[PDB]
């Protein structure tokens, strides 16, 4: 009777979990290889022109490589499938809340968003690739329950796309239960207990699928040591301690995160109404994405070229290190922030022992990356806003940690790694303002429970101080 219907529902949720894991590992593998190729070309070209003059050809090579990749990404996005632009999380959030924006029910949207996010992280923009993983999981789940049956019903479709969005969050951040609570914050029109188990089944099977395929891409099939596209794990040193000295410090850091999130949202609001008003033809959108990729390449190169902090290579801090003007055997330090992927600069900011970052270098990188991510977000590319927000927050959180380590006599409790974590949670809650799902995600991905209560306080403080100025980003883009 009804038992075969529930087996059909559970096997559909198993397929959308497996397919979302395969799409996530496809994105990670292709981005890793293509960014490896592009950064090896540029590092091989800077070192050729380091002596004997030149070095403006390296800037043109960087700018044109960024421009070519984002030109491909925006001709794909802004001409063919225009709703594929952005992270798509506002569209899925309002899909779960009830209103159906068109052209989400097509497999073409999945192909354009996956290809766009491959060609945008490679393209050198300030883009995280786990923003649109939620939308990719959503359209996979919607496309499973269609044609080209009693699953085309809108009650059955909304629950399946809820499971797809949860599988997207779990494949993104390594958070199964975080994916469950993300799917339940929107469209919570019921507490169907079998629906939450379906959601958790798809969520956990998506994380385990991404483990299995990424580990067979690595050496050991038996390892499973990569739960997500970002994994800033192992917060269980003596730097795990949060203490009564630090709870009002975390509340104040949540206030600063909420203020800077309001600044981010307001500047992007004025920018995106300028883009609605004037830059609305598809050809102008393609040209604007090409220039902003060229500008983030050249402002990265101006900041690299005009920096004097040089530190020697510790074993894994620099992926593609270049010595620009440093001495032999010492490598550049600002070039470690624009050549690392943003999923690794965050981990480095969480884990480097104190005194490993210049305040001037990190401050300049923070300011330029803040304005770059604010400019790059409202574009016609397939692009998240998570890891830009998380890197901005980790960077100024580490600056806060260095300041607290200087004001006190280099105390044990003022470790800059922990304050980088709390800053990243503060800015991600200031820009986005999701309350509980980030608490569970930032508990899950760090594998620490004692960061549950202070991260939860920081997210509430950032949300409240942010909402007294301007709405959140994912809610603002349903109001244009």
């Amino acid at each position: 009777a009804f038992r075969t219907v529930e087996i059909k529902r559970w096997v559909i949720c198993a397929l959308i979990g497996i397919l979302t894991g395969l799409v996530a590992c496809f994105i990670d593998i292709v981005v890793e290889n293509l960014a490896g190729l592009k950064y090896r070309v540029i590092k091989g070209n800077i070192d050729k022109f380091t002596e004997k003059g030149g070095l403006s050809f390296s800037l043109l090579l960087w700018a044109t490589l960024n421009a070519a990749f984002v030109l491909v990404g925006s001709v794909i996005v802004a001409f063919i499938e225009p709703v594929a632009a952005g992270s798509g999380i506002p569209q899925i959030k309002c899909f779960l809340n009830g209103v159906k924006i068109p052209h989400v029910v097509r497999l073409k949207t999945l192909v354009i968003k996956v290809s766009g996010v491959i060609l945008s992280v490679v393209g050198g923009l300030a883009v995280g690739k786990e923003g649109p993983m939620i939308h990719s999981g959503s359209v996979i789940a919607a496309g499973i329950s269609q044609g080209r049956e009693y699953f085309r019903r809108d009650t059955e479709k909304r629950d399946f796309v809820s499971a797809g969005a949860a599988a997207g969050v779990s494949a993104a951040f390594g958070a199964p239960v975080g994916g469950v609570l993300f799917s339940l914050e929107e469209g919570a029109s019921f507490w169907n207990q079998f629906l939450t188990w379906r959601i958790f089944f798809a969520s956990m099977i998506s994380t385990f699928t991404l483990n299995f395929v990424l580990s067979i891409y690595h050496g050991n099939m038996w390892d499973l040591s990569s739960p997500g596209l970002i994994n800033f794990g192992r917060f269980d040193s003596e730097k795990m301690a949060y203490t009564i000295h630090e709870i009002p410090v975390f509340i104040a850091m949540g206030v600063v995160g909420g203020v800077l999130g309001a600044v981010f949202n307001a500047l992007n609001y004025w920018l995106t109404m300028f883009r609605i008003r004037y830059i609305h033809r598809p050809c102008l959108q393609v040209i604007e994405a090409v220039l902003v990729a060229a500008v983030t390449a050249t402002v990265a190169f101006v900041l690299i070229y005009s920096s004097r902090d040089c530190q020697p290579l510790q074993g894994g801090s620099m992926s593609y290190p270049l010595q620009l003007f440093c001495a032999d055997g010492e490598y550049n330090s600002m070039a470690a922030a624009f050549f690392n992927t943003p999923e690794k600069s965050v981990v480095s900011l969480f884990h480097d022992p104190p005194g490993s970052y210049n305040p001037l270098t990190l401050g300049l990188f923070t300011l330029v990356y803040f304005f770059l991510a604010c400019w790059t977000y409202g574009l016609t590319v397939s692009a998240g806003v998570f890891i830009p927000s998380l890197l901005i927050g980790a960077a100024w959180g580490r600056l806060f940690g260095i300041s607290l380590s200087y004001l006190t006599g280099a105390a044990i409790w003022a470790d800059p790694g922990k304050y980088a974590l709390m800053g990243a949670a503060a800015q991600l809650g200031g820009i986005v303002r999701m309350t509980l799902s980030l608490t569970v995600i930032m508990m899950e991905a760090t594998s620490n429970v004692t960061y549950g209560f202070p991260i939860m306080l920081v997210l509430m403080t950032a949300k409240i101080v942010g909402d007294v100025f301007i709405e959140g980003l994912y809610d603002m883009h349903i109001q244009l």
Binding site: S56, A63, F274, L291, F301, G315, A327
Partner: protein, 203 residues
């Protein structure tokens, strides 16, 4: 039989004590101008052979809380592995690893050319730096590891000394003097969105 020792085991312990005192001597004779894996490899084979000689006996290792012989042998192994002296020996041991004797010969050659009183002996230094980078890449395909793994310590400190002479003391790096094409290209590309946004505003 308990508080005293078997006389051959006493002699075995005395032999290990003599050999290990010589090794600690060798490690600190050659402390700052680092020749740790260059002058103390045969003493290290001596000490690890006496430690293997003890455990073929039973009373020497685990019959007290501290196990002073075992923690001393573990300290010499930790000092060996942190130094990575296996690159200063061949894979069959007790030799001097023909990759590195060329490096030490060129290091001595470079310093004797530095003894000639400015920027004259440069291609010897460039050959040295090319050789050092070649051995670094050799230390990741024969012995697979992460990028920037640590080489043998006397090689690495020889290259340390050469680079600290060449940069911090002699002050010779022939700077770029190509700033103004970079600043021209940079102000052009930064002025490009000003042109684009104003022209789209005025259309």
């Amino acid at each position: 039989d308990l508080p005293d020792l078997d006389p051959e085991c006493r002699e075995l312990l005395l032999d290990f004590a003599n050999s290990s005192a010589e090794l600690t001597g060798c490690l600190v004779r050659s402390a700052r101008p680092v020749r740790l894996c260059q002058t103390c490899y045969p003493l290290f084979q001596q000490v690890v052979s006496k430690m293997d000689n003890i455990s073929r006996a039973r009373s020497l290792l685990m019959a007290d809380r501290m196990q002073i012989v075992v923690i001393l042998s573990e300290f010499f192994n930790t000092t060996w592995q942190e130094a990575n002296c296996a690159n200063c020996l061949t894979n069959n041991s007790e030799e001097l690893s023909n990759s590195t004797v060329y490096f030490l010969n060129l290091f001595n050659h470079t310093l004797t050319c530095f003894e000639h009183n400015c920027k004259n002996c440069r291609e010897a230094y460039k050959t040295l730096s090319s050789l050092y980078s070649e051995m670094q890449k050799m230390n990741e395909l024969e012995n697979k590891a992460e990028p920037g793994t640590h080489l043998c310590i006397d090689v690495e400190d020889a290259m340390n000394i050469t680079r600290k002479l060449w940069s911090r003391t002699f002050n010779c790096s022939v700077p770029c003097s190509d700033t103004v094409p970079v600043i021209a290209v940079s102000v052009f590309i930064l002025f490009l969105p000003v042109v684009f946004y104003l022209s789209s505003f005025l259309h």
